[PDB]
Amino acid sequence: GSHMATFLIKHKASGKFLHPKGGSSNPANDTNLVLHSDIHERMYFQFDVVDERWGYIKHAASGKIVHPLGGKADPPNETKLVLHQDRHDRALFAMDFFNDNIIHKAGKYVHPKGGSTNPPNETLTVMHGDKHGAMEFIFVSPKNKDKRVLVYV
Amino acid sequence: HMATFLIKHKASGKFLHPKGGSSNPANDTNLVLHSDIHERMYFQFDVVDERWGYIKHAASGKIVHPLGGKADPPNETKLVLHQDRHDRALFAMDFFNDNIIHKAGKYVHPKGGSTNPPNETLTVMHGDKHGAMEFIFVSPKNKDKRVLVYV
Protein backbone atom coordinates (compact mmCIF):
# COMPACT_ATOMS: atom_id res chain seq x y z
CA GLY A 1 0.00 0.00 0.00
CA SER A 2 0.95 3.73 -0.04
CA HIS A 3 2.51 3.59 3.53
CA MET A 4 5.95 1.91 3.05
CA ALA A 5 9.21 1.39 4.81
CA THR A 6 12.40 2.79 3.34
CA PHE A 7 15.43 0.50 3.56
CA LEU A 8 18.63 -0.78 2.01
CA ILE A 9 18.68 -4.18 0.31
CA LYS A 10 21.95 -5.68 1.57
CA HIS A 11 23.64 -8.71 0.03
CA LYS A 12 24.39 -10.68 3.17
CA ALA A 13 27.66 -12.39 2.12
CA SER A 14 29.39 -9.26 0.70
CA GLY A 15 27.75 -6.36 2.49
CA LYS A 16 27.06 -4.67 -0.82
CA PHE A 17 23.67 -3.18 -1.68
CA LEU A 18 21.18 -3.22 -4.52
CA HIS A 19 21.43 -0.10 -6.74
CA PRO A 20 20.16 1.08 -10.10
CA LYS A 21 23.22 1.00 -12.38
CA GLY A 22 24.44 4.55 -12.43
CA GLY A 23 22.66 5.67 -9.30
CA SER A 24 20.15 8.05 -10.95
CA SER A 25 17.22 9.67 -9.23
CA ASN A 26 15.21 8.71 -12.29
CA PRO A 27 16.74 5.67 -14.07
CA ALA A 28 15.56 4.92 -17.60
CA ASN A 29 13.22 2.04 -18.08
CA ASP A 30 15.12 -1.22 -18.22
CA THR A 31 18.07 0.05 -16.19
CA ASN A 32 19.96 -2.87 -14.73
CA LEU A 33 19.95 -3.53 -11.01
CA VAL A 34 23.48 -4.03 -9.70
CA LEU A 35 25.36 -4.54 -6.48
CA HIS A 36 27.49 -1.64 -5.17
CA SER A 37 29.04 -0.62 -1.85
CA ASP A 38 27.94 3.02 -1.89
CA ILE A 39 25.08 4.22 0.32
CA HIS A 40 22.93 7.20 -0.76
CA GLU A 41 19.24 8.07 -1.18
CA ARG A 42 19.19 6.95 -4.82
CA MET A 43 19.71 3.29 -3.69
CA TYR A 44 16.95 3.29 -1.09
CA PHE A 45 14.06 0.90 -1.74
CA GLN A 46 10.51 0.49 -0.46
CA PHE A 47 8.20 -2.51 -0.46
CA ASP A 48 4.65 -1.90 -1.76
CA VAL A 49 2.55 -4.71 -0.34
CA VAL A 50 -0.08 -5.91 -2.79
CA ASP A 51 -1.34 -9.35 -1.75
CA GLU A 52 -0.26 -10.97 1.51
CA ARG A 53 3.46 -11.67 1.00
CA TRP A 54 3.50 -10.37 -2.56
CA GLY A 55 4.40 -6.83 -3.52
CA TYR A 56 6.55 -4.50 -5.57
CA ILE A 57 10.19 -3.68 -4.79
CA LYS A 58 10.04 0.06 -5.38
CA HIS A 59 13.00 2.36 -6.06
CA ALA A 60 12.34 5.17 -3.60
CA ALA A 61 13.72 8.00 -5.70
CA SER A 62 11.98 7.26 -8.96
CA GLY A 63 9.01 5.07 -8.26
CA LYS A 64 10.10 2.48 -10.81
CA ILE A 65 9.93 -1.10 -9.56
CA VAL A 66 12.05 -4.23 -9.95
CA HIS A 67 11.22 -6.50 -12.87
CA PRO A 68 12.75 -9.58 -14.47
CA LEU A 69 13.60 -8.07 -17.89
CA GLY A 70 10.99 -8.72 -20.52
CA GLY A 71 7.93 -9.37 -18.30
CA LYS A 72 7.75 -13.13 -18.79
CA ALA A 73 5.40 -15.07 -16.47
CA ASP A 74 8.17 -17.61 -15.62
CA PRO A 75 11.57 -16.03 -16.32
CA PRO A 76 14.40 -18.48 -16.91
CA ASN A 77 17.58 -18.64 -14.93
CA GLU A 78 19.92 -15.75 -15.68
CA THR A 79 17.09 -13.31 -16.58
CA LYS A 80 18.44 -9.88 -15.68
CA LEU A 81 16.73 -7.73 -13.08
CA VAL A 82 15.90 -4.14 -14.13
CA LEU A 83 13.84 -1.18 -13.08
CA HIS A 84 10.70 -0.30 -15.02
CA GLN A 85 7.72 1.96 -14.47
CA ASP A 86 5.11 -0.72 -15.19
CA ARG A 87 3.16 -2.19 -12.27
CA HIS A 88 1.75 -5.68 -12.98
CA ASP A 89 1.71 -9.17 -11.51
CA ARG A 90 4.94 -10.35 -13.18
CA ALA A 91 6.83 -7.85 -10.99
CA LEU A 92 5.56 -9.40 -7.72
CA PHE A 93 8.17 -10.53 -5.19
CA ALA A 94 8.16 -11.49 -1.53
CA MET A 95 10.78 -10.28 0.95
CA ASP A 96 11.63 -13.41 2.99
CA PHE A 97 13.06 -11.95 6.15
CA PHE A 98 13.18 -15.34 7.82
CA ASN A 99 15.24 -17.26 5.30
CA ASP A 100 16.86 -14.02 4.09
CA ASN A 101 16.11 -14.06 0.37
CA ILE A 102 13.99 -12.29 -2.29
CA ILE A 103 11.66 -14.63 -4.12
CA HIS A 104 9.70 -13.87 -7.32
CA LYS A 105 6.13 -15.02 -7.64
CA ALA A 106 7.15 -17.74 -10.17
CA GLY A 107 9.58 -19.18 -7.61
CA LYS A 108 13.13 -18.10 -8.52
CA TYR A 109 15.31 -15.91 -6.38
CA VAL A 110 17.34 -12.72 -6.83
CA HIS A 111 21.08 -13.54 -7.24
CA PRO A 112 24.29 -11.76 -8.08
CA LYS A 113 25.10 -12.85 -11.64
CA GLY A 114 27.63 -15.66 -11.26
CA GLY A 115 26.73 -16.44 -7.70
CA SER A 116 29.77 -15.02 -5.87
CA THR A 117 29.83 -14.47 -2.21
CA ASN A 118 31.94 -11.37 -2.86
CA PRO A 119 31.04 -9.79 -6.17
CA PRO A 120 32.64 -6.61 -7.50
CA ASN A 121 30.81 -3.31 -7.67
CA GLU A 122 28.54 -3.08 -10.70
CA THR A 123 27.78 -6.81 -10.75
CA LEU A 124 24.43 -7.45 -12.38
CA THR A 125 21.62 -9.23 -10.64
CA VAL A 126 19.57 -12.06 -12.15
CA MET A 127 16.80 -14.54 -11.39
CA HIS A 128 17.97 -18.07 -10.53
CA GLY A 129 16.33 -21.04 -8.85
CA ASP A 130 19.28 -22.03 -6.77
CA LYS A 131 19.42 -21.40 -3.00
CA HIS A 132 22.78 -20.87 -1.28
CA GLY A 133 24.54 -18.34 0.88
CA ALA A 134 25.39 -15.99 -1.96
CA MET A 135 21.70 -15.28 -2.75
CA GLU A 136 20.84 -14.17 0.79
CA PHE A 137 19.72 -10.58 1.43
CA ILE A 138 18.74 -8.61 4.56
CA PHE A 139 16.71 -5.41 4.75
CA VAL A 140 18.28 -2.70 6.86
CA SER A 141 17.96 0.90 8.01
CA PRO A 142 19.40 3.62 5.78
CA LYS A 143 21.02 5.07 8.91
CA ASN A 144 22.32 1.77 10.24
CA LYS A 145 23.28 -0.88 7.75
CA ASP A 146 23.39 -3.58 10.45
CA LYS A 147 19.87 -2.93 11.84
CA ARG A 148 17.17 -5.04 10.25
CA VAL A 149 13.89 -3.27 9.60
CA LEU A 150 10.42 -4.64 8.94
CA VAL A 151 9.52 -4.17 5.28
CA TYR A 152 5.91 -5.41 5.62
CA VAL A 153 4.02 -2.34 6.52
CA HIS B 1 -8.22 -2.00 10.79
CA MET B 2 -5.43 -4.31 12.10
CA ALA B 3 -5.16 -7.76 10.51
CA THR B 4 -7.57 -10.25 12.08
CA PHE B 5 -6.96 -13.86 11.19
CA LEU B 6 -7.30 -17.54 12.02
CA ILE B 7 -4.24 -19.55 13.09
CA LYS B 8 -4.60 -22.79 11.16
CA HIS B 9 -2.63 -25.96 11.92
CA LYS B 10 -1.40 -26.84 8.44
CA ALA B 11 -1.37 -30.64 8.74
CA SER B 12 -4.89 -31.06 10.24
CA GLY B 13 -6.79 -27.88 9.29
CA LYS B 14 -7.75 -27.30 12.92
CA PHE B 15 -7.35 -23.84 14.46
CA LEU B 16 -5.92 -22.29 17.61
CA HIS B 17 -8.61 -21.50 20.20
CA PRO B 18 -8.76 -20.49 23.84
CA LYS B 19 -9.81 -23.65 25.68
CA GLY B 20 -13.56 -23.35 26.12
CA GLY B 21 -14.05 -20.85 23.33
CA SER B 22 -14.84 -17.87 25.40
CA SER B 23 -14.80 -14.22 24.40
CA ASN B 24 -13.42 -13.66 27.90
CA PRO B 25 -10.95 -16.40 28.83
CA ALA B 26 -9.29 -15.99 32.22
CA ASN B 27 -5.55 -15.51 32.64
CA ASP B 28 -3.63 -18.74 32.09
CA THR B 29 -6.31 -20.31 29.93
CA ASN B 30 -4.69 -22.96 27.69
CA LEU B 31 -4.46 -22.54 23.94
CA VAL B 32 -5.81 -25.61 22.16
CA LEU B 33 -6.51 -26.89 18.67
CA HIS B 34 -10.14 -27.21 17.58
CA SER B 35 -12.02 -27.49 14.27
CA ASP B 36 -14.83 -25.02 15.11
CA ILE B 37 -14.86 -21.55 13.65
CA HIS B 38 -16.29 -18.45 15.41
CA GLU B 39 -15.32 -14.99 16.41
CA ARG B 40 -13.84 -16.17 19.67
CA MET B 41 -11.01 -17.93 17.82
CA TYR B 42 -9.90 -14.84 15.81
CA PHE B 43 -6.38 -13.53 16.49
CA GLN B 44 -4.43 -10.36 15.84
CA PHE B 45 -0.67 -9.62 15.97
CA ASP B 46 0.77 -6.49 17.57
CA VAL B 47 4.25 -5.76 16.22
CA VAL B 48 6.83 -4.74 18.86
CA ASP B 49 10.28 -4.99 17.24
CA GLU B 50 10.76 -5.90 13.56
CA ARG B 51 9.69 -9.58 13.39
CA TRP B 52 8.80 -9.79 17.10
CA GLY B 53 5.39 -9.07 18.56
CA TYR B 54 2.43 -10.25 20.62
CA ILE B 55 -0.04 -12.83 19.35
CA LYS B 56 -3.39 -11.50 20.57
CA HIS B 57 -6.79 -13.11 21.11
CA ALA B 58 -8.98 -10.56 19.36
CA ALA B 59 -12.08 -10.82 21.58
CA SER B 60 -10.23 -10.31 24.90
CA GLY B 61 -6.92 -8.67 24.15
CA LYS B 62 -5.11 -11.46 25.99
CA ILE B 63 -1.79 -12.43 24.42
CA VAL B 64 0.03 -15.72 24.09
CA HIS B 65 2.56 -16.61 26.80
CA PRO B 66 4.60 -19.58 27.77
CA LEU B 67 2.93 -20.61 31.09
CA GLY B 68 4.97 -18.92 33.83
CA GLY B 69 6.37 -16.22 31.56
CA LYS B 70 10.02 -17.38 31.52
CA ALA B 71 12.50 -16.07 28.91
CA ASP B 72 13.79 -19.48 27.87
CA PRO B 73 11.06 -22.01 28.57
CA PRO B 74 11.80 -25.77 28.30
CA ASN B 75 10.22 -28.18 25.87
CA GLU B 76 6.61 -29.03 26.73
CA THR B 77 5.91 -25.69 28.35
CA LYS B 78 2.20 -25.04 27.84
CA LEU B 79 0.99 -22.07 25.88
CA VAL B 80 -1.65 -19.90 27.55
CA LEU B 81 -3.40 -16.57 27.23
CA HIS B 82 -2.60 -13.79 29.69
CA GLN B 83 -3.20 -10.06 29.88
CA ASP B 84 0.33 -9.10 30.85
CA ARG B 85 2.73 -7.62 28.29
CA HIS B 86 6.47 -8.25 28.53
CA ASP B 87 9.36 -9.44 26.41
CA ARG B 88 8.96 -13.10 27.34
CA ALA B 89 5.69 -13.08 25.36
CA LEU B 90 7.39 -12.14 22.05
CA PHE B 91 6.89 -14.34 19.05
CA ALA B 92 7.46 -14.06 15.30
CA MET B 93 4.96 -15.20 12.71
CA ASP B 94 7.13 -16.96 10.10
CA PHE B 95 4.81 -17.01 7.09
CA PHE B 96 7.65 -18.27 4.85
CA ASN B 97 8.55 -21.44 6.75
CA ASP B 98 4.98 -21.62 8.18
CA ASN B 99 5.73 -21.64 11.90
CA ILE B 100 5.39 -19.59 15.06
CA ILE B 101 8.73 -19.00 16.83
CA HIS B 102 9.28 -17.64 20.34
CA LYS B 103 12.03 -15.12 21.09
CA ALA B 104 14.24 -17.89 22.59
CA GLY B 105 13.92 -20.08 19.51
CA LYS B 106 11.37 -22.77 20.29
CA TYR B 107 8.16 -23.19 18.26
CA VAL B 108 4.46 -23.62 18.91
CA HIS B 109 3.48 -27.28 18.65
CA PRO B 110 0.45 -29.44 19.25
CA LYS B 111 1.25 -31.43 22.42
CA GLY B 112 2.38 -34.83 21.14
CA GLY B 113 3.29 -33.61 17.70
CA SER B 114 0.54 -35.29 15.75
CA THR B 115 -0.33 -34.43 12.16
CA ASN B 116 -3.93 -34.98 13.20
CA PRO B 117 -4.44 -33.84 16.79
CA PRO B 118 -7.92 -34.30 18.18
CA ASN B 119 -10.07 -31.39 19.23
CA GLU B 120 -8.96 -29.93 22.55
CA THR B 121 -5.30 -30.91 22.14
CA LEU B 122 -3.12 -28.55 24.11
CA THR B 123 -0.33 -26.49 22.59
CA VAL B 124 3.23 -26.39 23.88
CA MET B 125 6.62 -24.99 23.09
CA HIS B 126 9.15 -27.37 21.56
CA GLY B 127 12.40 -26.86 19.77
CA ASP B 128 11.88 -29.42 16.98
CA LYS B 129 10.84 -28.50 13.45
CA HIS B 130 8.64 -30.85 11.48
CA GLY B 131 5.44 -30.87 9.43
CA ALA B 132 3.08 -31.13 12.45
CA MET B 133 4.28 -27.83 13.92
CA GLU B 134 3.45 -25.80 10.78
CA PHE B 135 0.79 -23.10 10.94
CA ILE B 136 -0.66 -20.73 8.34
CA PHE B 137 -2.47 -17.45 8.96
CA VAL B 138 -5.74 -17.13 7.06
CA SER B 139 -8.76 -14.92 6.44
CA PRO B 140 -11.74 -15.46 8.76
CA LYS B 141 -13.96 -15.48 5.64
CA ASN B 142 -11.73 -17.79 3.58
CA LYS B 143 -9.67 -20.38 5.51
CA ASP B 144 -7.62 -21.10 2.41
CA LYS B 145 -6.56 -17.48 1.83
CA ARG B 146 -3.37 -16.44 3.63
CA VAL B 147 -3.40 -12.95 5.14
CA LEU B 148 -0.47 -10.71 6.18
CA VAL B 149 -0.37 -10.64 9.98
CA TYR B 150 2.23 -7.80 10.23
CA VAL B 151 -0.24 -5.04 9.24
Residue numbers in the entry:
A (entry chain B): -3 to 149
B (entry chain A): -1 to 149
Please share excerpts from the published article on this structure.
The structure is well ordered, with the entire main-chain of each monomer visible in the 2mFo-DFc electron density map, revealing a β-trefoil fold consisting of three related sub-domains. MytiLec is somewhat unusual in binding ligand at each subdomain, and it forms a dimer in solution, giving a total of six ligand sites per protein.
Apo-MytiLec crystallised in space-group P21, and diffracted to 1.1 Å resolution. The lack of an obvious search model led us to determine phases using a heavy atom derivative, which was aided by the strong diffraction of the physically robust crystals. Two monomers of MytiLec are found in the asymmetric unit, and the model shows expected geometrical features and has no Ramachandran outliers. Several N-terminal residues remaining from the thrombin-cleavable tag are also present in the apo-MytiLec electron density map, so that chain numbering of the apo structure starts at -1 or -3. Least-squares fitting the Cα atoms of residues 1 to 149 of each chain in the apo-MytiLec model gives a rmsd of 0.27 Å. The two monomers in the asymmetric unit are closely associated by hydrophobic interactions and hydrogen bonds, as shown in Supplementary Tables S1 and S2. PISA18 reports the buried interface area between MytiLec monomers to be about 740 Å2 per chain. Two adjacent phenylalanine residues, Phe 93 and Phe 94, sit opposite their symmetry mates at the dimer interface. MytiLec was originally reported to be a monomer in solution on the basis of gel filtration but analytical ultracentrifugation confirms the protein is a tightly-bound dimer, and mutation of Phe 93 and Phe 94 blocks dimerisation. In order to observe any changes in the protein on ligand binding, both the apo and GalNAc complex structures were determined. Both the apo crystal and the co-crystal with ligand were cryo-protected immediately prior to flash-cooling by soaking in mother liquor containing 25% glycerol.
